[PDB]
Write an enzyme that holds these catalytic residues in place. Structure first.
Site, PDB file in Angstrom:
ATOM      1  CB  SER A   1      -0.690   0.150   1.399  1.00 17.55           C
ATOM      2  OG  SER A   1      -1.605  -0.846   1.552  1.00 17.55           O
ATOM      3  CB  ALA A  69       0.302  -2.834   6.041  1.00 23.88           C
ATOM      4  CG  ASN A 241       3.411  -1.540   2.688  1.00 24.03           C
ATOM      5  OD1 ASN A 241       2.723  -0.854   3.439  1.00 24.03           O
ATOM      6  ND2 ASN A 241       2.904  -2.282   1.687  1.00 24.03           N
TER       7      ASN A 241
END
Ligand SMILES: O=C(O)Cc1cc(O)ccc1O
Ligand SMILES: [Ca+2]
Lengths: 557, 206
Positions: A1, A69, A241
């Site tokens: 992401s 995340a 990430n």
């Protein structure tokens, strides 16, 4: 992401711009759900996975937020000491403690019911047990007991009006998640949220600890320790990430690493290229990074050095000159199924051969299979999530850096041979494999593009739609499952905020019993494919002006 | 009016909820979710609780057992019982608003039941707060904040120790799965701060 947030000093025609592409895979109906909530202290607009109560992506007219995340290490495993006599007990701080246990019955359509027991200790549920050693492993999460409070922190943060109020709510979200902020005055911020254990000295978090008492966590670290920045000197925040901060340790997964080779560098290059960006330029980074080969930048210098003394008719050299002319951006041909340049196929075969001669060879079977993937592995339906640099390739990148890598090379992964010799042998393996299938004329090589599938099964592998509801898109794009952009104090409008998003296939998943499909079942699918977007409305007057329908209910609790 | 919930949908079908208190606001939200995404929500509810095999059969028994072994439902219900009335309203309002549309659906199934329920042969059931909370736990805590491979790491380490000897097996483990790497690109620049903790990287716990 990924996410990029652009502040006052970097923004052009606005004070702040936030672009977010959360990557969860691609599904039908859509992973996220669009929703505006006006009342009880709330005035929000945005979209959120599985329609949670709290909106993971959106804004409230004064601030805006998004997530990626975190991958911090917030889970450790406790090796519990069992007893052959006195079963259901375990040793903890000098006494034999009894386990929690519950019985479960699985009912089965058209079968017989199955019942099993689940066991739990003070450290957590029991994953697996070794009857031979009399050990049982218990998975212990730092967020255990705080699931519901994390959900509520994600709902209450929608009311925050500044940094101070927003960070109060970030301090209560306990999952390992990066959180991002922007506001109407042009401030921007980032917090790597979550609860992390306060481990005993000598505890190596990548491996199991004895569950008998002495290795127990001391508690949880305070929120002051969580990596966080407000109004960074750079003017922007970018993440894909990648690590939050210098010296922060990553998840203990063997396949996950934060090293010198990282895909976030691809976003950094684009934001550093221009002194200021507009909203239209911030949106256009979605298009570039979507199409960028991630291995090119990493290993092109190595390939160039190794073939530098080769003649022009040596085919290993011609493969490296094709790569040298390429910018790494994949583009489809007019057939809708092959890429315009063969670069990703060459890197793919090269890297597979390089890993098999280097990393794979130093690792004992059957662990060698963890480090052989090149990172291009897919099927006909395409990747199930984002494209990344593989583990084996991040480990190989450190080895080709030499003493410039901070990681001690305990085993020489080139096994005594000069690097160039191993690179040239892999390059010969590549030429042999590809010329066999495509021929010798590199310029007419038409190599298969990756496609993109909106799956009918949810991420667990369970149907959430019938098999025919699957949707196919010709071009694979390395981008968010949804994309949303928020622009604060636009100089080009009178509105204090402007926001857009795209939620594909569409807002609705409804299909009537006669097979009639809802009107909003797939009206965002072509917009997704062409990098378009729809406006998000917040104020009453904009909602009224774009209203298609209205339903009023009267209900008393 | 305190009893009024107004739902306005835009040109893309996106719902905006106007209501005056918490319970009414989240009831509206639940109600449009049940309108737009009822089958998806019901299979997500069975996925996060491990009840897939009751409607889909024997291929899903291992799945269902794995889901159930990875959580402790009584600890979730205890967290729900400690909420204040305002927070509890969020969850209870949401489940009640869904229930309102599910009641209309199970009363007029010829026009309102989503086709896939006929296709897979079963009908929606009513939700409680526990089910709303379990959507978030199973798809955000449980999948995405639960990653570990500590037991597989240890079997890697043990096989590296056999191949290269005890000290050497450890040093290769640190080459393959380092704890930290000072050259990783970071979202926060080093001029702003660095993480202050240092960790053991010898497996000193054995
Ligand atoms: O990126 C992921 O793989 C998972 C993930 C994405 C995101 O945007 C927010 C939370 C989260 O867990
Ligand atoms: Ca760990």
């Amino acid at each position: 992401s990924n996410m990029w947030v652009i502040g006052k000093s970097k923004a052009q025609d606005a004070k702040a711009i936030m672009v977010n592409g959360p990557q969860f895979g691609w599904y039908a109906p859509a992973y996220t759900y669009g929703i505006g909530l006006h009342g009880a202290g709330y005035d929000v607009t945005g979209n959120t996975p599985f329609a949670y109560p709290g909106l993971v992506f959106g804004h409230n007219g004064v601030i805006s937020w998004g997530s990626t995340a975190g991958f911090g290490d917030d889970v450790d495993i406790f090796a519990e000491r069992l007893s052959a006599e006195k079963p259901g007990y375990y040793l903890h701080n000098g006494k034999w403690v009894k386990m929690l246990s519950r019985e479960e019955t699985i009912t089965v359509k058209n079968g017989q019911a199955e019942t099993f027991t689940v066991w739990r200790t003070v450290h957590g549920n029991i994953l697996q047990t070794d009857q031979t050693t009399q050990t049982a492993y218990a998975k212990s999460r730092a967020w255990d007991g705080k699931e519901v409070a994390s959900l509520l922190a994600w709902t209450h943060q929608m009311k925050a009006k500044n940094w101070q109020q927003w960070t109060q709510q970030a301090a209560k979200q306990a999952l390992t998640i990066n959180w991002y902020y922007a506001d109407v005055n042009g401030n921007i911020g980032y917090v790597h949220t979550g609860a992390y254990p306060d481990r005993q000295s000598g505890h190596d978090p990548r491996l199991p600890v004895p569950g008998t008492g002495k290795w127990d966590w001391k508690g949880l670290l305070p929120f002051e320790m969580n990596p966080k920045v407000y109004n960074p000197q750079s003017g922007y925040i970018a993440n894909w990430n990648n690590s939050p901060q210098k010296d922060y340790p990553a998840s203990d997964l063997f396949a996950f690493l934060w090293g010198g080779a990282d895909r976030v560098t691809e976003i950094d290059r684009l934001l550093e290229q221009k002194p200021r960006l507009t909203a239209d330029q911030a949106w256009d980074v979605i298009r570039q990074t979507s199409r960028q080969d991630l291995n090119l930048r990493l290993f092109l210098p190595t390939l160039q050095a190794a073939t530098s003394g080769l003649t022009q008719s040596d085919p290993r050299r011609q493969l490296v000159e094709t790569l040298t002319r390429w910018d790494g951006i994949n583009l489809l041909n007019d057939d809708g199924k092959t890429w315009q340049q063969p670069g990703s196929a060459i890197l793919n075969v090269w890297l597979t051969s390089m890993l098999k001669r280097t990393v794979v060879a130093a690792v004992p079977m059957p662990f060698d299979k963890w480090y052989s993937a090149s990172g291009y592995e897919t099927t006909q339906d395409g990747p199930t999530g984002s494209l990344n640099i593989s583990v084996g390739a991040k480990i190989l990148y450190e080895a080709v850096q030499g003493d410039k890598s901070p990681i001690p090379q305990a085993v020489d992964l080139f096994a005594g041979k000069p690097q160039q010799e191993v690179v040239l042998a892999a390059l010969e393996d590549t030429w042999e494999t590809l010329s066999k299938r495509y021929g010798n004329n590199v310029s007419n090589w038409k190599t298969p593009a990756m496609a993109l599938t909106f799956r009918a099964n949810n991420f667990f592998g369970v149907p959430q739609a019938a098999a025919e509801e699957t949707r196919h898109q010709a071009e694979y794009q390395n981008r968010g499952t949804e994309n949303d952009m928020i622009v604060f104090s636009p100089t080009t409008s009178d509105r204090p905020v402007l926001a857009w998003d795209v939620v594909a296939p569409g807002q609705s998943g409804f299909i009537a019993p006669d097979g009639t499909v809802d009107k909003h079942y797939e009206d965002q699918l072509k917009m997704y494919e062409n990098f378009g977007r729809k406006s998000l409305w917040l104020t009453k007057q904009d909602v009224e002006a774009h209203k298609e329908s209205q339903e009023v209910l009267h209900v008393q609790r | 009016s305190s009893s009024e919930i107004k739902i306005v949908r835009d040109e893309y079908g996106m719902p905006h909820i106007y209501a005056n208190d918490t319970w009414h606001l989240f009831y509206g939200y639940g109600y449009v979710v049940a309108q737009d995404r009822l089958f998806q929500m019901e299979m997500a509810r069975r996925s996060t609780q491990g009840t897939v095999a009751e409607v889909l059969g024997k291929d899903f028994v291992k799945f269902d057992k794995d889901i159930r072994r990875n959580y402790w439902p009584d600890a979730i219900r205890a967290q729900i019982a400690a909420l204040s009335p305002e927070d509890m309203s969020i969850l209870q309002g949401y489940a009640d608003g869904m229930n309102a549309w599910i009641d209309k659906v199970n009363t007029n199934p010829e026009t309102l039941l989503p086709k896939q329920f006929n296709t897979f042969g079963f009908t929606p059931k009513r939700w409680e707060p526990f089910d709303v909370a379990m959507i978030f736990v199973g798809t955000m805590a449980n999948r995405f904040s639960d990653s570990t491979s500590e037991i597989d790491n240890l079997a890697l380490l043990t096989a590296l120790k056999d191949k290269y000897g005890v000290s050497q097996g450890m040093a290769v483990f640190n080459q393959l799965k380092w704890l930290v790497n000072p050259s990783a690109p970071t979202t926060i620049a080093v001029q702003e701060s660095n993480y202050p903790l240092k960790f053991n990287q010898q497996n000193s716990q054995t």
